[PDB]
Design an enzyme around this catalytic site. Structure first.
Site, mmCIF file in Angstrom:
data_model
loop_
_atom_site.group_PDB
_atom_site.id
_atom_site.type_symbol
_atom_site.label_atom_id
_atom_site.label_comp_id
_atom_site.label_asym_id
_atom_site.label_seq_id
_atom_site.Cartn_x
_atom_site.Cartn_y
_atom_site.Cartn_z
ATOM 1 C CG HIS A 142 29.750 -0.942 10.183
ATOM 2 N ND1 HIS A 142 28.664 -1.318 10.979
ATOM 3 C CD2 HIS A 142 30.580 -2.005 10.163
ATOM 4 C CE1 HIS A 142 28.884 -2.553 11.419
ATOM 5 N NE2 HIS A 142 30.042 -2.987 10.955
ATOM 6 C CG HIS A 172 37.209 -9.311 12.542
ATOM 7 N ND1 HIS A 172 36.259 -10.211 12.175
ATOM 8 C CD2 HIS A 172 36.597 -8.079 12.521
ATOM 9 C CE1 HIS A 172 35.090 -9.569 11.989
ATOM 10 N NE2 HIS A 172 35.261 -8.248 12.151
HETATM 11 C C1 HEM Z 1 31.896 -10.936 7.000
HETATM 12 C C2 HEM Z 1 32.193 -9.684 7.281
HETATM 13 C C3 HEM Z 1 32.145 -9.126 8.630
HETATM 14 C C4 HEM Z 1 31.405 -9.475 9.709
HETATM 15 C C5 HEM Z 1 30.245 -10.487 9.734
HETATM 16 C C6 HEM Z 1 31.853 -8.699 10.826
HETATM 17 C C7 HEM Z 1 31.272 -8.746 12.086
HETATM 18 C C8 HEM Z 1 31.553 -7.953 13.240
HETATM 19 C C9 HEM Z 1 30.828 -7.963 14.458
HETATM 20 C C10 HEM Z 1 29.505 -8.633 14.710
HETATM 21 C C11 HEM Z 1 31.478 -7.088 15.224
HETATM 22 C C12 HEM Z 1 31.134 -6.705 16.657
HETATM 23 C C13 HEM Z 1 30.264 -5.481 16.882
HETATM 24 C C14 HEM Z 1 30.339 -5.246 18.418
HETATM 25 O O1 HEM Z 1 29.736 -6.088 19.169
HETATM 26 O O2 HEM Z 1 30.993 -4.307 18.928
HETATM 27 C C15 HEM Z 1 32.665 -6.610 14.539
HETATM 28 C C16 HEM Z 1 33.692 -5.831 15.034
HETATM 29 C C17 HEM Z 1 34.732 -5.247 14.256
HETATM 30 N N1 HEM Z 1 34.913 -5.524 12.917
HETATM 31 FE FE1 HEM Z 1 33.938 -6.740 11.730
HETATM 32 N N2 HEM Z 1 32.886 -7.974 10.471
HETATM 33 C C18 HEM Z 1 33.086 -8.147 9.160
HETATM 34 C C19 HEM Z 1 34.032 -7.534 8.405
HETATM 35 C C20 HEM Z 1 34.913 -6.506 8.786
HETATM 36 C C21 HEM Z 1 35.805 -5.770 7.950
HETATM 37 C C22 HEM Z 1 35.855 -5.888 6.465
HETATM 38 C C23 HEM Z 1 36.491 -4.833 8.771
HETATM 39 C C24 HEM Z 1 37.568 -3.825 8.498
HETATM 40 C C25 HEM Z 1 38.555 -3.941 7.598
HETATM 41 C C26 HEM Z 1 35.970 -5.051 10.122
HETATM 42 C C27 HEM Z 1 36.485 -4.531 11.304
HETATM 43 C C28 HEM Z 1 36.016 -4.760 12.591
HETATM 44 C C29 HEM Z 1 36.598 -4.122 13.810
HETATM 45 C C30 HEM Z 1 37.813 -3.302 13.828
HETATM 46 C C31 HEM Z 1 35.814 -4.433 14.837
HETATM 47 C C32 HEM Z 1 36.061 -4.090 16.273
HETATM 48 C C33 HEM Z 1 35.233 -3.020 16.946
HETATM 49 C C34 HEM Z 1 35.705 -2.540 18.270
HETATM 50 O O3 HEM Z 1 36.871 -2.782 18.642
HETATM 51 O O4 HEM Z 1 34.861 -1.902 18.959
HETATM 52 N N3 HEM Z 1 35.122 -6.114 10.081
HETATM 53 N N4 HEM Z 1 32.737 -7.233 13.358
#
Ligand code: HEM
Ligand code: HEM
Ligand code: NA
Ligand code: NA
Lengths: 713, 713
Positions: B77, B244
């Site tokens: 982010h 993800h």
């Molecule tokens: C279309 C693009 C993306 C969308 C819509 C998206 C959406 C989200 C959402 C809604 C969450 C959950 C927030 C929560 O409830 O804790 C999340 C978690 C996460 N996203 Fe994404 N994401 C996107 C792209 C990315 C990219 C580009 C990365 C990194 C290279 C990333 C890495 C992560 C990680 C690692 C988590 C896990 C957080 C945790 O374990 O607490 N995401 N994502």
């Protein structure tokens, strides 16, 4: 474009501490205005201003062939925004040329006045500021029209962006009282720090309170607002009758003909506003206030005709051609000249607020005295005009040029001249060792010097440690100063002083003012030594001790701190949260956010709090100069919650055991909450920051000790 | 407190040019972050971050015993706000820790992540910035979980206040499109310069467009927003599937349990927000987005299980416990571990936007290749993560530390190394004289160097004269650059260069990039001489010439100036007034309001306007460096009115005779209209200002020439 202000409209605003950066300033960072002004040919400027008085421009023709009245009004408005509550407003920064004052309704057509001055400003450039020029122009207008002024000082440096001033909460110009953002409550009590009756006015409404044309009730608002600008009854009557000896008002047709104020006008208007569709829009057809009053039979010449007319006729309520309430003399002949047409004459007229000078009983006695003794009126007006136009300039050391009056006036908070050798660095080391050997503590030394110095405000350059007024009424009795503790410290310092002075040769002596500040420096040095650091604190001697007779107790009351977050002090409960009041105090002390941060963290651990409150004292080594405040505040092992008894006090408990570790106020905890402040606290609470903390603290301590030191320039 | 913004909400805002003053900065004015960073023990910081990954704090327990997923999201982010249109946003200034980003809904609970890092930040102090630490922590997370990153560069200096960015016009968080402040129009066209679909989102809505759970339509928003952050299809798929692979989302109960974001929370919360009344409020009960998805069978280990699951199951639309749409694998076993309870397992789940990677046909081909060849997936992700997290850092000369990748990437706009002696001061004087003797005019020399240097933007540190990319596609064909005139100038300067380089010994040579800038310096010197003034304009050599093969033409498109007030140029008609676009350009060039004023007044009279327009050319001695722009603009003998044909063009006529003297645009006349700009124009239009004008113009010219010179630091 949605901004942080839109989302979080109550978050604290730190940008007021970072105004007036070298970034917004077009002059070099070595530019010194005092030096430029002292080389100006002031006599040449005055000749040009004299010529200008009767050089009418067709885009804004001169009433009676003479711009004098317009320029007196321009200068009285420049000065007239001053409030004694905070020292903000006044003529001393030239703010009439910026928003919002350039566009206040009460400043209508002063845009024209300032534009007429552009050729002179252009010719003399940086050697005369706009701020100085507006006042000097008023003076020349008076002189051109036969009135001898008391004098004039230059030195008002120009500023380059608007000042952050609370002018009120109304969202409508000229809103009458009792609205959702009323500045009035109770029995017509005007909220501090305001000094005008409506948003966009200078003092009062010329038609009467909330537009009701009663001269007696108008007098009450006159008295209250002029007092809030530091003027008593005598000064008030002299100023109003003096001003209204000259010129005229402008209300030739309905107000709805007048277009946008300068900040709202189109770009083609090139900085001017209030363009009028009424007939020619100017001159004989001018509309400014909407009133149509000419006071005397020679509006371009000093006369005693104001009071002859006020007392010599009875008055009838009438309306101007724009619909405004005003007064006309019953049965009078047409004796008042027309501003443009030599074949017309007019009956004498007056504003409601002019009639106040006759129908308020206390004003009436002064007005009659001035009527019977016009030389006293002349002298009183001259002195009052000087005061009005210089009240925000600060100590006499800042006054420049060849027309400065030699007479010392009580309202200048005067400081005696120093006539004896000053102490040197060897003497200062000896006096600090004596202070430390007397038994005074770090906490007593720091608290006393902070109390003495922190009355300074950069808005009108009043207050500070020079003068040793902390020993006099009323400072010595202020609750924030801890009067019993203060008395005991001053008594010990006075014995040290008497013994040092008694031992000297030649005329060498130390003032109490210098010794208070020196003893504070010794406190800070001792506090650094308690922490294991070897630190020297700079000190500059040369303060002098003012007498009680040179210290006007009523005028001094506005410097009383009712909120001082640096000592975690709040005198009562206010509508404004305490952290907003801290930032306001930092602004008056001329501190940046990093300076405010350092300063407050250091003061907390040195024992500067009022009454030895533990709130914010986040250290187990009080009286040692360390960064403990920041390291403990930022420790995530502690959880904070407001207390049951008091929502403005917070308890900090170990997160694992629940055990109480600290308490704090909102002033304390804001440093761990506001995202910019917390970023600053992080720098000072880092493991590599102890030496930086100490050095920065000593710098800001020294800055505050010197704020009023205009003798060292 | 009513403010100028309240009264005049459409007046121009100059405060954006005066942020980042030495007043607001707690570090000393000699602090150099690069020097502090170069001594950091980066290996020791990485070992501490590594231990942190599995040291759970009870105020925010770690999912699966590992904070890795949380910190990857935090770092994504931090970088994910970047927009290619203006270069604003991104990770490079650590802005996630200030308003408004610290409180965006999509940044919920990242406050907890940043707080977990405070003890490390505290230990290492000024030697590692928050900006760098955010990114580094993401890298260490990935490493700790078995992923090999492509490298890491330090050098992102911390900032101390929020940057002024246009994030949209909506007054409500997450407002669906088609409102009164809609960021969308036409066939789902997102307004430039925005790069997210809703206010407070990073790119897209994880539920689908405006909340409609269709993966196909979601893919279109993914593709559009990622392109607006400079990422193509391959990089997009690698990033989303890569991210993800780790961790989980949090939606354990209804959203109405969640309280105020950090900027709205109470002071006791000490900078944290989103406090939840749902059960324990954290850990197993956490609510962040409202979704409840765990993507892989080993959320704390790099695997290729994201694509195994995405392709190995069919998916059913379902709801989280907070009510959000999400997807669950039809008929699957419970194979996904629970984050806190070792005896529970869950079925595979996905976001709508995850399934975009399979149901969009272009994404599907990439995702299948990555499924079949996970070594390709790993390499693509590593490269993309590097690019994501470094895209706003600027030229490779700014990259610090021991992990900088040696591979030179096309997106870095690379500049070849200089391997020969540079020209000295005598050579530079010889080259200036040769340029002037060629017949090139002041106007051609100044215009060409301005065109080359003024592509710089301080938001992502792209553009500038280094590289001589003005001679390449696409710069050489930009309309603002006057392509036929440019080609003639470059041909002459290339002959001068070939002749000087052919005559040298010993390797000495001059690049065309340096000669373009030197030739502009000669133009400015000549313009000063035409006015009667001898000045030397500083020049620093060392630029190099990039090739067409090292220049990505599509990536360069965003640097095209479509509005450049400094050349009085507007490529088409925009919603935004041209003066607002001038201030926006000045902010990208890092200029203050005084620097912008000087620079524009000077450029006008030197002939820098596109197409030799006379608009704003208020002089009878064009190509002489004088303050004529200001003197003439401020002359009250001239009256200005908009033309009938065009309301954004104004005619200046003698007030007395009606004679046409000048024409100008809004960009010209704003300097005579806006109250703060006119105050600056007055200083340069004064009779004493000629030497100051020349000196200040030379200083700001030189600043602009050097904006991209990070090789000289
Ligand atoms: C279309 C693009 C993306 C969308 C819509 C998206 C959406 C989200 C959402 C809604 C969450 C959950 C927030 C929560 O409830 O804790 C999340 C978690 C996460 N996203 Fe994404 N994401 C996107 C792209 C990315 C990219 C580009 C990365 C990194 C290279 C990333 C890495 C992560 C990680 C690692 C988590 C896990 C957080 C945790 O374990 O607490 N995401 N994502
Ligand atoms: C109760 C306090 C006062 C009130 C309500 C007030 C009200 C006004 C108003 C309404 C005007 C007419 C503006 C126009 O339509 O052009 C005016 C004019 C003027 N006032 Fe005052 N006034 C006050 C005090 C002062 C003071 C203290 C001075 C100067 C010492 C001053 C000097 C003038 C002069 C010289 C003009 C004439 C302007 C011209 O000739 O263009 N007044 N006053
Ligand atoms: Na003031
Ligand atoms: Na950026």
């Amino acid at each position: 474009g949605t901004s942080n202000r839109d989302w979080w409209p109550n978050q604290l605003d730190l940008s007021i501490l970072h105004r007036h950066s070298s970034l917004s300033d077009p002059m070099g960072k070595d530019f010194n205005y005092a030096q430029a002004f002292e080389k100006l040919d002031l006599a040449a400027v005055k000749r040009d201003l004299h010529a200008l008085m009767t050089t009418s421009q067709d885009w804004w023709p001169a009433d009676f062939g003479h711009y004098g009245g317009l320029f007196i009004r321009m200068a009285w408005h420049s000065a007239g925004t001053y409030r004694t509550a905070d020292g903000r407003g006044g003529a001393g920064e030239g703010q009439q040329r910026f928003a919002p004052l350039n566009s206040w309704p009460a400043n209508a057509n002063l845009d024209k006045a300032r534009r007429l001055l552009w050729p002179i400003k252009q010719k003399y450039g940086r050697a005369i500021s706009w701020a100085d020029l507006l006042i000097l122009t008023g003076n020349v207008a008076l002189e051109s029209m036969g009135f001898k002024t008391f004098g004039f000082a230059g030195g008002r440096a120009d500023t380059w962006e608007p000042e952050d001033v609370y002018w009120g909460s109304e969202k409508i110009w000229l809103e009458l009282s009792g609205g959702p953002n009323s500045r009035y409550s109770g029995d017509r009590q005007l909220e501090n720090p305001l000094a005008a009756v409506e948003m966009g006015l200078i003092y009062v409404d010329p038609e009467g309170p909330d537009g009701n044309p009663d001269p007696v009730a108008a007098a009450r608002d006159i008295r209250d607002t002029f007092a809030r600008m530091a003027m008593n009854d005598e000064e008030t009557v002299a100023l109003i009758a003096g001003g209204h000896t000259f010129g005229k008002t402008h209300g030739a047709g309905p107000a709805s003909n007048v277009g946008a104020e300068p900040e709202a006008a189109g770009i083609e208007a090139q900085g001017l506003g209030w363009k009028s569709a009424y007939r020619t829009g100017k001159g004989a057809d001018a509309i400014t206030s909407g009133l149509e009053v000419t006071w005397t039979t020679t509006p371009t010449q000093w006369s005693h005709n104001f009071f002859e007319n006020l007392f010599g006729y009875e008055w009838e309520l009438t309306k101007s051609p724009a619909g405004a309430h005003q007064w006309v003399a019953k049965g009078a002949d047409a004796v008042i000249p027309d501003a443009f047409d030599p074949s017309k004459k007019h009956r004498p007229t007056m504003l409601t607020t002019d009639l106040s000078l006759r129908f308020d009983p206390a004003y009436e006695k002064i007005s009659r005295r001035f009527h019977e003794n016009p030389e006293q009126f002349a002298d009183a007006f001259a002195r009052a005009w000087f005061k009005l136009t210089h009240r925000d300039m600060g100590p006499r050391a800042r006054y420049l040029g060849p027309e400065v009056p030699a007479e010392v006036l009580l309202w200048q908070d005067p400081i005696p001249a120093v006539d004896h050798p000053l102490i040197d660095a060897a003497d200062a080391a000896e006096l600090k060792a004596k202070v430390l050997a007397s038994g005074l503590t770090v906490s007593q030394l720091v608290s006393t010097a902070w109390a003495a110095a922190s009355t300074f405000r950069g808005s009108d350059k009043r207050g500070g440690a020079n003068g040793a007024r902390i020993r006099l009424a009323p400072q010595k009795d202020w609750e924030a100063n801890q009067p019993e503790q203060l008395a005991a410290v001053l008594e010990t310092l006075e014995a040290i002083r008497t013994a040092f002075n008694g031992a000297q040769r030649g005329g060498k002596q130390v003032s109490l003012a210098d010794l208070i500040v020196l003893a504070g420096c010794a406190g800070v040095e001792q506090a650094a030594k308690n922490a294991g650091h070897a630190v020297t604190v700079p000190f500059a001697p040369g303060r002098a001790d003012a007498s009680q007779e040179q210290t006007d107790v009523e005028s001094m009351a506005v410097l009383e701190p009712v909120a001082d977050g640096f000592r975690n002090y709040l005198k009562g409960k206010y509508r404004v949260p305490a952290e907003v009041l801290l930032v306001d105090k930092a602004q008056l002390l001329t501190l940046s956010a990093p300076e405010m941060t350092v300063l407050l963290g250091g003061l907390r651990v040195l024992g500067a709090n009022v009454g030895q409150s533990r709130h914010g004292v986040f250290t187990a080594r009080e009286q040692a100069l360390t960064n403990d405040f920041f390291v403990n505040l930022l420790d995530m092992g502690t959880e904070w919650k407001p207390t049951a008894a008091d929502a403005d006090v917070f308890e900090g408990r170990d997160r694992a055991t629940g055990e109480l570790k600290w308490t704090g106020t909102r002033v304390d905890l804001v440093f761990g909450s506001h995202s910019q402040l917390r970023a600053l606290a992080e720098v000072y609470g880092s493991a590599d920051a102890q030496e930086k903390f100490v050095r920065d603290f000593v710098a800001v301590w020294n800055k505050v000790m010197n704020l009023d030191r205009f003798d060292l320039a």
